[PDB]
């Protein structure tokens, strides 16, 4: 399948070179996989989700995304127009409030929730969790991410937007999960992207168009935007049977475009997520 005039990030993850505008992908499109988006929530009613999104848990008064961040990230995972894995099932877990903030204890609870809840869902091709959040180092938060990964969920987390070494941030700094940095449309490391030896992979993160609340769309930037590209790619590859939850991060790194990125500091991987699609 091919989507013409795709958002640049989708085109980029299906090409060996920057500057293309078509997203090429297998029609299976992540069908049979499930991705939990652990964030401010998801506007499940947005036409772009085609009824494939549901809120399953909230830690606040409502399950509504009053912010937009979670809806944007969910859109990049699996919306019709803006998504990597266009047929995947999306589950929303609201651990962040409508200002986009949340306590570490609530974030941990949300991770433990997903490890259990997945046992109640029909996801024959596997389960992914996308965490576009983080803050200062916490061994407890790292531990929660490690448990979630251990339980059989492919965990993808944002590296952070501090232009610093991600070793000082969580859950970015947990080695066992897939830590995602951001790039721009000219194959540069995004100016805000964290870096360091704990990064596993880069994905598109500057000027990413996706779904927003009120049935709208908008473009925003962050390692929050790169993370769902990798989460969606993982769901896509699991559905094709190329990899499993336990090994997807390594598979993505192995099959990445290598050496394409500029402004990568020594000691950080130069690897950009790539779907290897051939018609």
């Amino acid at each position: 399948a091919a989507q013409t005039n795709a958002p640049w990030g989708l085109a980029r993850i299906s090409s060996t070179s920057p500057g293309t505008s078509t997203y090429y992908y297998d029609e299976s499109a992540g069908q049979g996989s499930c991705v939990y988006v652990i964030d401010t929530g998801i506007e499940a009613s947005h036409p772009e989700f085609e009824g494939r999104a549901q809120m399953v848990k909230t830690y606040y008064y409502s399950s509504r995304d009053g912010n937009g961040h979670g809806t944007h990230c969910a859109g990049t995972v699996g919306s019709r127009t803006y998504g990597v894995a266009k047929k995947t099932q999306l589950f929303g877990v609201k651990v962040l409030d409508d200002n986009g903030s949340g306590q570490y204890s609530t974030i941990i609870a949300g991770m433990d929730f997903v490890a259990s809840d997945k046992n109640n869902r029909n996801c024959p091709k596997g389960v992914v969790a996308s965490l576009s959040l983080g803050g200062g180092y916490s061994s407890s938060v790292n531990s929660a991410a490690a448990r979630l990964q251990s339980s059989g969920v492919m965990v993808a987390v944002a590296a952070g937007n501090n232009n610093a070494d991600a070793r000082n941030y969580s859950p970015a700094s947990e080695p066992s999960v897939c830590t995602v940095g951001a790039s721009d449309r000219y194959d540069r490391r995004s100016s805000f992207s964290n870096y360091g030896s704990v990064l596993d992979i880069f994905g598109p993160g500057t000027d990413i168009l996706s779904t927003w609340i009120g049935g709208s769309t908008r473009s925003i930037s962050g390692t929050s935007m790169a993370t769902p590209h990798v989460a969606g790619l993982a769901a896509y590859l699991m559905t094709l049977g190329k990899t499993t939850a336990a090994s997807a991060c390594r598979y993505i790194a192995d099959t990445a475009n290598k050496g394409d990125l500029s402004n990568i500091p020594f000691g950080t991987v130069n690897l950009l997520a790539y779907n290897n699609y051939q018609a």
């Binding site: 937009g68 961040h69 962040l96 200002n99 986009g100 949340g102 803050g135 937007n161 925003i220």
Partner: peptide, 11 residues
């Protein structure tokens, strides 16, 4: 959280 969600950006 300790990270983003603002919406009047930082570059």
């Amino acid at each position: 959280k300790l990270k983003l969600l603002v919406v009047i950006r930082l570059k």
